[PDB]
Amino acid sequence: TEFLKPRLVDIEQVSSTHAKVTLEPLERGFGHTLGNALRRILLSSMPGCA
Amino acid sequence: GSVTEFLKPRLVDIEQVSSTHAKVTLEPLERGFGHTLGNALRRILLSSMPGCAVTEVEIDGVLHEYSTKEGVQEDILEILLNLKGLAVRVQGKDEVILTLNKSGIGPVTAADITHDGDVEIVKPQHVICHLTDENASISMRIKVQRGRGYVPASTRIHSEEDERPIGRLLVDACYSPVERIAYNVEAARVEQRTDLDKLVIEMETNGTIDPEEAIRRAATILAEQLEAFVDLRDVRQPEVKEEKPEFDPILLRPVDDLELTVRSANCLKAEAIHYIGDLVQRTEVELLKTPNLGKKSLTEIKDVLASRGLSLGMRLENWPPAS
Amino acid sequence: AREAKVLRMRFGIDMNTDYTLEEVGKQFDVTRERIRQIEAKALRKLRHPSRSEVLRS
Amino acid sequence: GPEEITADIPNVGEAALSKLDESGIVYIGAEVTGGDILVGKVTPKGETQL
Amino acid sequence: GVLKIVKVYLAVKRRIQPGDKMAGRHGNKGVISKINPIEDMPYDENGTPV
Domains along the sequence of chain C with CATH:
1-57 (1.10.10.10)
How far apart CA B142 and CA B98 sit, in angstroms, is: 5
How far apart CA B87 and CA E19 sit, in angstroms, is: 34
Our CA dihedral for A43, A44, A50, B2, rounded to 10 degrees, sits at: -110
Query: Is the Cα dihedral B111, B22, E41, B177 positive or negative?
Result: negative
Closest CA to A27 of B181, B38, B222, B232: B222
Cβ pair A3:B228 closer than 8 A = no
Is there a contact between B105 and B133 (Cβ–Cβ < 8 Å)? yes
- Probe site for chain E from D27, D38, D41, D42 (most E CB atoms < 10 A): D38
Is there a contact between D7 and D23 (Cβ–Cβ < 8 Å)? yes
Closest CA to B55 of B141, B135, B166, B138: B141
Is there a contact between B14 and B212 (Cβ–Cβ < 8 Å)? yes
Angle at CA of residue B242, ends B236 and B248, nearest 5°: 150
Is there a contact between B22 and B14 (Cβ–Cβ < 8 Å)? yes
How far apart CA C14 and CA C10 sit, in angstroms, is: 11
Cβ pair E8:D26 closer than 8 A = yes
Q: Reduced to 3 states, what is the DSSP secondary structure of residue A5?
A: coil
How far apart CA E9 and CA A47 sit, in angstroms, is: 69
Cβ pair B182:E37 closer than 8 A = no
Residue type, B60: D
Pairing between β-strand B52-59 and β-strand B137-146 as defined by DSSP bridges: antiparallel
How many Cα atoms are found within 13 Å in the side-chain-facing hemisphere of D47?
A: 3
Helix H or strand E encompassing A9: strand A9-12
Is there a contact between B37 and B9 (Cβ–Cβ < 8 Å)? yes
- Helix and strand numbers (H, E) in chain C are 4, 0
DSSP sequence for B177-229: -EEEEEEE--B---SS-SS-EEEEEEEEE-SSS-HHHHHHHHHHHHHHHHGGG
How many Cα atoms are found within 13 Å in the side-chain-facing hemisphere of B309?
A: 17
How far apart CA E14 and CA E23 sit, in angstroms, is: 17
Q: Where are the alpha helices (DSSP H) in chain A?
A: 30-42
> How many whole angstroms from its chain centre is CA B149?
10
Helix H or strand E encompassing B80: helix B76-84
> How many whole angstroms from its chain centre is CA C17?
14
Closest CA to B77 of C30, A36, E11: E11
Q: Which CATH number fits domain B261-323: 1.10.150.20, 3.20.20.70, 3.40.50.880, 3.40.50.300?
A: 1.10.150.20
User: Chain B residue with minimal CA distance to E49?
Assistant: B180
The count of other CB atoms within 10 Å of the CB of residue A41 is: 13
DSSP designation for B47 = S
Residue spans per domain, chain B: 1-50+176-229, 51-175, 261-323
D40 CB-near residues (< 8 Å, 6+ apart): D5, D6, D7, D8, D9, D16, D20, D23, D24, D25
Cβ of residue B309 closer than 8 Å to a chain C Cβ:
yes
Cβ pair E15:B66 closer than 8 A = no
> How many whole angstroms from its chain centre is CA E14?
7
How far apart CA D7 and CA D46 sit, in angstroms, is: 20
DSSP designation for D46 = -
Which of A6, A41, A47 faces B36 most closely, judged by CB atoms?
A41
> How many whole angstroms from its chain centre is CA B31?
40
How far apart CA D26 and CA B174 sit, in angstroms, is: 31
B46 min Cα distance to partner chain E (Å): 6
The beta-carbon contacts of B251-258 under 8 Å, at least 24 apart in sequence, are B251/B275, B251/B276, B251/B277, B251/B280, B251/B316, B252/B277, B255/B279, B256/D14, B257/D13, B257/D14, B258/B301, B258/B304, B258/B305, B258/B308
User: Chain D residue with minimal CA distance to B62?
Assistant: D29
Angstrom CA distances, B23 to B20, B181, B219, stand at 10, 10, 16
Angstrom CA distances, E36 to A26, A29, B46, B47, E28, stand at 16, 10, 13, 12, 21
How far apart CA A25 and CA A9 sit, in angstroms, is: 9
Which of B47, B182, B184 faces E39 most closely, judged by CB atoms?
B47
Cβ of residue A47 closer than 8 Å to a chain E Cβ:
no
Q: Reduced to 3 states, what is the DSSP secondary structure of residue C38?
A: helix
Cβ of residue D38 closer than 8 Å to a chain E Cβ:
yes
Residue type, B143: K
Chain A to chain B Cβ contacts (< 8 Å): 55
How far apart CA B87 and CA B110 sit, in angstroms, is: 9
Same fold? B1-50+176-229, B261-323:
no
Q: Reduced to 3 states, what is the DSSP secondary structure of residue B128?
A: strand
Closest CA to C6 of C17, C16, C19: C19
Cβ pair B257:D27 closer than 8 A = no
How far apart CA B36 and CA A36 sit, in angstroms, is: 8
Closest CA to B91 of B2, B228, B189, B208: B208
- Probe site for chain C from B248, B250, B310, B315 (most C CB atoms < 10 A): B248
**CATH 3.30.1360.10 for domain B1-50+176-229:** yes
**From start to end of chain B, where are the E strands?**
11-15, 21-29, 52-59, 88-90, 95-103, 106-109, 119-121, 127-131, 137-146, 168-170, 178-184, 197-205
For B51-175, CATH number? 2.170.120.12
Closest CA to B18 of B119, B112, B123, B125: B123
B231 CB-near residues (< 8 Å, 6+ apart): none
D46 CB-near residues (< 8 Å, 6+ apart): none
Q: At what angle do helices B32-46 and A30-42 cross, to 10 degrees?
A: 180
Q: Reduced to 3 states, what is the DSSP secondary structure of residue B11?
A: strand
By the 10 Å C-beta count (0-12 exposed, 13-18 middle, 19+ buried), B54 is classed as: buried
Q: At what angle do helices B262-270 and B295-306 cross, to 10 degrees?
A: 90
User: Chain C residue with minimal CA distance to B309?
Assistant: C47
Is there a contact between B268 and B232 (Cβ–Cβ < 8 Å)? no
- Probe site for chain B from D31, D32, D33, D36 (most B CB atoms < 10 A): D31
Cβ of residue E2 closer than 8 Å to a chain D Cβ:
yes
Looking at beta carbons, which residues of chain B come within 8 Å of D27? 166
> Resolution of this entry in Å?
3.7
Query: Is the Cα dihedral D10, D13, D17, D18 positive or negative?
Result: negative
B42 min Cα distance to partner chain D (Å): 39
Cβ pair D29:B64 closer than 8 A = yes
Closest CA to B175 of B49, B301, B285: B49
Is there a contact between A17 and A35 (Cβ–Cβ < 8 Å)? no
User: Chain E residue with minimal CA distance to B41?
Assistant: E39
Is there a contact between B175 and B62 (Cβ–Cβ < 8 Å)? no
The count of other CB atoms within 10 Å of the CB of residue B75 is: 14
